Design a protein around this ligand. Sequence first.
Ligand SMILES: Fc1c(Cl)c(F)c(Cl)c(F)c1Cl
Length: 164
Amino acid sequence: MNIFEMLRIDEGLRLKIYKDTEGYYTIGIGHLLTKSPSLNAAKSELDKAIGRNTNGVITKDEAEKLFNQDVDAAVRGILRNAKLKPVYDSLDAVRRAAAINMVFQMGETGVAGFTNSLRMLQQKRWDEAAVNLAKSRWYNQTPNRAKRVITTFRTGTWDAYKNL
Ligand SMILES: Fc1c(Cl)c(F)c(Cl)c(F)c1Cl
């Protein structure tokens, strides 16, 4: 198990434009195209991302290319964010993957409200942190995924993913 395998499980793989859990146009391995309700706008974003005129369908190789870029972008974003870098640096590699997972799903803006959770994680108060993380829109809207990510933060193991 690693961050790539983990997000592959959580996001799936679809080669045609689909709507994510929030109703937003997406492709590949959870590559958000746009929050716009216009399919044409989404198709434009896809073409720009891939570098060719696609009309809504990509190959597995192309999906994996975008996926690698997205994982890279999430990490680089954490490292440039003053509110996130210290907590990330304080973690082991397994829990770091859980951090990347969250940023991949909700972005840096989606995680701005997790200040108290972040403190508890840096304090290594794993059970308290797990309890706090679940008190969120995130947990309520995607409970099964959140539970897996939270278990990863609580235990520092891959137990929530090893069966999957
Ligand atoms: F280190 C982190 C980071 Cl960078 C992050 F964005 C979240 Cl949501 C998190 F929980 C942890 Cl531990």
